[PDB]
């Protein structure tokens, strides 16, 4: 009965942690935008999210065509895919992360709803062994992991107490610490001694007694939980991709992915927001390939991927399937968008449809006010179109007006007009097929707002590598 997309959080208001889609065909992007909006996620945060196929263990590229009834049996989760370790800035041993600030706040990576979704997703991955007890060897590491997992289960229940507005003791009786710890630790407890069970129960009941009502807020419990999860789980917020073949090649010595007239994994390629692209064979050490800003393009031919660096060196990869190659290319392309270029994509095979449209129609992403001002200020008659920073389906046509700030010093006043979709500008009797068509008609015309007039002389276009709040700066 339709495509059921699973949620880790239903957003404010709540309800069923899923969204069912009945439309004959939809893109993965349309799905994510619809869900992001329902959950309260804002437009500057939309591109952090993607759809994960939990059974096939692949993510969908944003141009993936979902079809109903054909895909009614797919098990998909809506999740944060693009992650920056230490974004909260709680580990001093690693750099900070922020959105570009105004020229010469809006610098925070996440909005309130993206943070709460991240926390709910983190709890799911934690319980699902993103950090396994089995991966440990020494008594010191095992003891630390168990004690930390109990502290995490304590934070999990404290949050629930605050969220539902009930004391910690009534939460502790409805929810067990065993349901808030990694599954590998839960299995360990069950298989081990009855006296060890009694002891862990008493250690946890003690953790509950050292709780102070009014000491911490819901937000502080969440940040600490997430920051502890990062410390416990080095794999959390990262992706390790298995490949069947891996080669490094210099371009002026051969063509990669060449058409010629699958096997067990030989390597893993690691991709992280703060560390770029690394690899290792399956004594172990991650070799470094490049950062996202070093990539010129990515070539995808069947299940074969080629990552091209500016110096013409290539990382050639054979993935287990076409769906695995599309998952992988959309991971590299998604981090490239966030760290290097808001208005470019590395491979047409996985390009976000809303971005392809934006590039051809000369539309900017959800830019904050100081970035649009820096674009309109050079000349009179300048204008631009950008996606709204609050509304997912609204475009903003913007002009700058002569104004006088307090002191008598000449200032700049912005006038914002909405374009809605068959794109229509609110106040103009015409209707257009594309925004490029609506913008081409706009060229040379005169805009009237109250008693003021504005010459629509030139449309500012997105420039390659230009900094804005859409760019994520790695400290």
């Amino acid at each position: 009965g339709g495509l059921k997309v699973l949620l880790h959080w239903a957003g404010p208001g709540g309800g069923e942690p899923w969204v069912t889609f009945s439309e004959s065909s939809l893109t993965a992007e349309e799905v994510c935008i619809h869900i992001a909006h329902k959950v309260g996620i804002t437009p500057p945060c939309f591109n952090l999210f993607a759809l994960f196929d939990a059974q096939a263990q692949v993510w969908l590229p944003p141009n993936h065509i979902l079809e109903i009834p054909r895909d009614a049996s797919l098990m998909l989760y809506f999740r944060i895919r693009f992650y920056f370790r230490n974004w909260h800035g709680m580990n001093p041993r690693e750099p900070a992360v922020y959105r570009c600030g105004p020229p010469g706040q809006g610098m925070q990576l996440l909005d309130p709803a993206s943070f709460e979704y991240l926390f709910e997703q983190g709890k799911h991955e934690f319980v699902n062994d993103v950090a396994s007890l089995w991966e440990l060897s020494t008594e010191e590491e095992i003891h630390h992991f168990k004690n930390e997992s109990l502290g995490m289960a304590f934070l999990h229940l404290c949050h629930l107490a605050l969220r539902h507005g009930i004391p910690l003791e009534e939460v502790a009786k409805k929810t067990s610490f065993k349901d808030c710890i990694p599954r590998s630790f839960r299995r360990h407890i069950r298989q081990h001694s009855a006296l060890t069970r009694l002891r862990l129960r008493n250690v946890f009941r003690r953790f509950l007694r050292d709780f102070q009502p009014g000491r911490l807020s819901q937000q502080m419990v969440m940040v600490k939980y997430l920051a502890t999860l990062e410390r416990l789980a080095p794999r959390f917020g990262t992706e390790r991709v298995p490949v069947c073949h891996l080669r490094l090649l210099a371009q002026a010595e051969g063509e990669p992915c060449y058409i010629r007239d699958a096997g067990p994994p030989t390597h893993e390629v690691l991709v992280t927001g703060t560390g770029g692209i690394q690899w290792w064979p399956v004594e172990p050490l991650w070799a470094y390939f490049c950062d996202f800003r070093d990539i010129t393009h990515v070539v995808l031919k069947e299940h074969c991927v080629s990552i091209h660096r500016q110096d013409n060196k290539c990382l050639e990869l054979s993935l287990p399937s076409r769906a695995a190659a599309l998952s992988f290319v959309s991971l590299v392309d998604g981090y490239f968008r966030l760290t290097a270029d808001s208005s470019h994509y590395l491979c047409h095979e996985v390009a976000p449809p809303r971005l392809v449209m934006s590039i051809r129609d000369g539309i900017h992403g959800p830019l904050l006010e100081p970035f649009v001002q820096a674009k309109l200020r050079p000349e009179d008659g300048l204008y631009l179109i950008h996606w709204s920073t609050s509304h997912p389906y609204r475009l903003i046509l913007t002009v700058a007006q002569r104004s006088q700030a307090p002191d008598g010093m000449q200032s700049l006043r912005l006038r914002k007009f909405p374009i809605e979709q068959a794109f229509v500008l609110e106040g103009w009797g015409r209707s257009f097929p594309s925004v490029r068509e609506l913008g081409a008609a706009l060229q040379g015309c005169l805009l009237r707002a109250g008693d003021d007039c504005f010459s629509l002389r030139r449309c500012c276009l997105p420039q390659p590598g230009e900094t804005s709040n859409l760019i994520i700066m790695r400290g």
Binding site: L368, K416, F417, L425, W428, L447, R448
Partner: peptide, 19 residues
């Protein structure tokens, strides 16, 4: 502080003169 503040555009009613 930790999180992205809301930013809604104040939008206005248009009128276009052609040629």
């Amino acid at each position: 502080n930790l999180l992205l503040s809301t930013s809604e555009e104040q939008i206005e009613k248009c009128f276009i003169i052609e040629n």
